[PDB]
Write a protein that binds this ligand. Sequence first.
Ligand SMILES: CCCCC/C=C\C/C=C\CCCCCCCC(=O)O
Ligand SMILES: CCCCC/C=C\C/C=C\CCCCCCCC(=O)O
Ligand SMILES: CCCCCCCCCCCC
Ligand SMILES: CCCCCCCCCCCC
Ligand SMILES: CCCCCCCCCC
Ligand SMILES: CCCCCCCCCC
Ligand SMILES: CCCCCCCCCC
Ligand SMILES: CCCCCCCCCC
Ligand SMILES: CCCCCCCC
Ligand SMILES: CCCCCCCC
Ligand SMILES: CCCCCCCC
Ligand SMILES: CCCCCCCC
Ligand SMILES: CCCCCCCC
Ligand SMILES: CCCCCCCC
Ligand SMILES: CCCCCCCC
Ligand SMILES: CCCCCCCC
Ligand SMILES: CCCCCC
Ligand SMILES: CCCCCC
Ligand SMILES: [K+]
Ligand SMILES: [K+]
Ligand SMILES: [K+]
Ligand SMILES: [K+]
Lengths: 257, 257
Amino acid sequence: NEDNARFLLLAALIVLYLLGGAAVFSALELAHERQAKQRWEERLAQFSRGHQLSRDELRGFLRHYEEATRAGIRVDNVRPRWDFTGAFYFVGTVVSTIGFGMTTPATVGGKIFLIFYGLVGCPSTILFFNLFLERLITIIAYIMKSCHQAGWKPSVYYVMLILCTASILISCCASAMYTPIEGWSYFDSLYFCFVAFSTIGFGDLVSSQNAHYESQGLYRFANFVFILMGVCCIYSLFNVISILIKQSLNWILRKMD
Amino acid sequence: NEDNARFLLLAALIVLYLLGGAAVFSALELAHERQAKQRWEERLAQFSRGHQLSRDELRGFLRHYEEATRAGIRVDNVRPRWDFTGAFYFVGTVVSTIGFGMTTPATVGGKIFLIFYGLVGCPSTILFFNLFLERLITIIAYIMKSCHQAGWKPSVYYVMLILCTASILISCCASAMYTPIEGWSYFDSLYFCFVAFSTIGFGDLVSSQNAHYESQGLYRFANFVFILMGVCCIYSLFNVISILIKQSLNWILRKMD
Ligand SMILES: CCCCC/C=C\C/C=C\CCCCCCCC(=O)O
Ligand SMILES: CCCCC/C=C\C/C=C\CCCCCCCC(=O)O
Ligand SMILES: CCCCCCCCCCCC
Ligand SMILES: CCCCCCCCCCCC
Ligand SMILES: CCCCCCCCCC
Ligand SMILES: CCCCCCCCCC
Ligand SMILES: CCCCCCCCCC
Ligand SMILES: CCCCCCCCCC
Ligand SMILES: CCCCCCCC
Ligand SMILES: CCCCCCCC
Ligand SMILES: CCCCCCCC
Ligand SMILES: CCCCCCCC
Ligand SMILES: CCCCCCCC
Ligand SMILES: CCCCCCCC
Ligand SMILES: CCCCCCCC
Ligand SMILES: CCCCCCCC
Ligand SMILES: CCCCCC
Ligand SMILES: CCCCCC
Ligand SMILES: [K+]
Ligand SMILES: [K+]
Ligand SMILES: [K+]
Ligand SMILES: [K+]
């Protein structure tokens, strides 16, 4: 009966969390949204009036441009899709369950292969992350024992603090490279790092997509390394926080009578 | 030395997997990509000649349209963002790490809150999925014991088969709708189900945004239920497959001496 009670309590807490978050986000974003929509409508009206065009023609043109944009066409000089390097980027985003969406299959045959490829490849990456976490815990224990100088395993709190510090350092080091090379601010770089590392992958900000990219040989390698390390660290941090949340739920159940 | 060897072997296998997958995907998709680009170029040239507009003016108009699209505007009628139910959909996509990208924060203050909200909310959903898997295993053992009529826990193989059957049934039941209600083909519905359930979330196909949606009260509830069950089942299946892959890695290590 304890497991059922814990399950029900967690479900209720998540429901309340979702409701509160929805209210807060709506209150934060509604005015901005409405203002942006009004600005777009004014711009569209001005363009239509200036060049004496018709709305239906503009709707057809925009539908064609929407089709072209899913094909892959952009307005500022993007790198080609479905070359070997682009395919490598795509499969890397697939196996990590990031799913930026900048590149998607469009043919029958590439979607069946997409399904089978993901079905065979995502568990391997999950196992790799688990093995990385185990190795990191072992090396942390060994380092601590050597510094003090088996039974020297660190507690969960210290592992959480170390993972937080590592994540902060990795994010600030990746941002220190993203900000100059891209046209991004430091806060935007940190936001992109958080969105990519947590495997949410909104897709609004994607790096390394500007055709000629200066040196472009070391830059792609550095991007790959940074994303890999960040994803590993954030995965481990989330697992530790989940363990702590389970302990807190147990305490909440015990206190209530 | 066994753990290091297993880590190295898994890394090498994943690297080879990525290379082969990139080569296959590129060979599958390059011709379609080139044909789509040529079609878009021809359409743009025909519009330009049709109405004698200069290229730069069209580039500016398309940049404005991209900015508008980043705020939610589409050529078809779509539901509003951030009212109260769009926010609920957004937070649901956030906590499950799906990240469709149809709705993203655009203000300073909504991005800090996004970071903290995700940091506190993703581990809770991970814990919920783990508890669901434990409860499912327990109930499966109970049903098996009752049918035969503690030590009656099923093997990993049978759990994998049952999870596969449940995933297929849930996908087919969800695809029974989504097909007439949204103009989608059955194969497209199955592809969308796989992409959403695995928490990849490309965002090319997103369900339940067409402004007026007939009943629209029961339909949203059914969509919520279907996505929740599918994500749970696919998460459990991936964990079981990861366990099997680890066993296979141990076997190949033993064979290589
Ligand atoms: C040592 C290998 C271990 C296995 C790696 C596992 C998962 C892959 C992780 C992250 C994907 C990173 C995105 C690819 C970047 C390509 C670089 C570029 O072209 O810009
Ligand atoms: C009751 C158990 C609580 C646990 C829920 C946990 C995570 C939420 C997961 C998936 C929700 C996906 C978003 C679907 C919302 C659609 C609603 C609409 O169409 O408007
Ligand atoms: C620019 C590199 C793209 C091809 C990917 C392979 C090289 C980097 C990773 C190799 C690690 C062994
Ligand atoms: C139409 C759905 C409105 C948004 C909130 C719905 C909450 C109902 C599902 C969970 C109740 C336990
Ligand atoms: C230790 C690596 C971090 C330093 C890289 C800074 C790059 C700044 C110039 C783009
Ligand atoms: C122009 C600088 C871009 C390359 C960054 C070098 C980092 C490589 C070592 C990790
Ligand atoms: C649970 C089985 C019912 C789901 C399919 C309903 C079909 C809906 C479209 C008419
Ligand atoms: C018209 C279809 C509306 C959805 C019916 C399904 C509701 C029960 C699902 C459990
Ligand atoms: C007897 C407890 C039932 C729990 C139902 C939970 C629904 C998600
Ligand atoms: C196009 C050059 C990259 C080829 C990959 C090399 C892997 C060893
Ligand atoms: C010998 C232990 C290997 C751990 C290395 C971790 C690399 C970041
Ligand atoms: C084009 C230079 C490739 C740099 C990556 C090689 C690292 C082993
Ligand atoms: C000597 C142990 C192997 C470390 C190589 C790094 C693996 C990514
Ligand atoms: C628990 C009831 C919540 C109702 C949400 C608002 C309905 C429009
Ligand atoms: C003993 C109650 C378990 C509930 C499982 C519900 C699965 C939908
Ligand atoms: C508008 C009808 C609401 C449907 C939700 C049912 C509550 C369990
Ligand atoms: C936090 C309770 C919900 C209030 C907004 C509908
Ligand atoms: C799988 C070997 C490499 C394929 C050609 C780049
Ligand atoms: K995702
Ligand atoms: K995504
Ligand atoms: K994900
Ligand atoms: K996405």
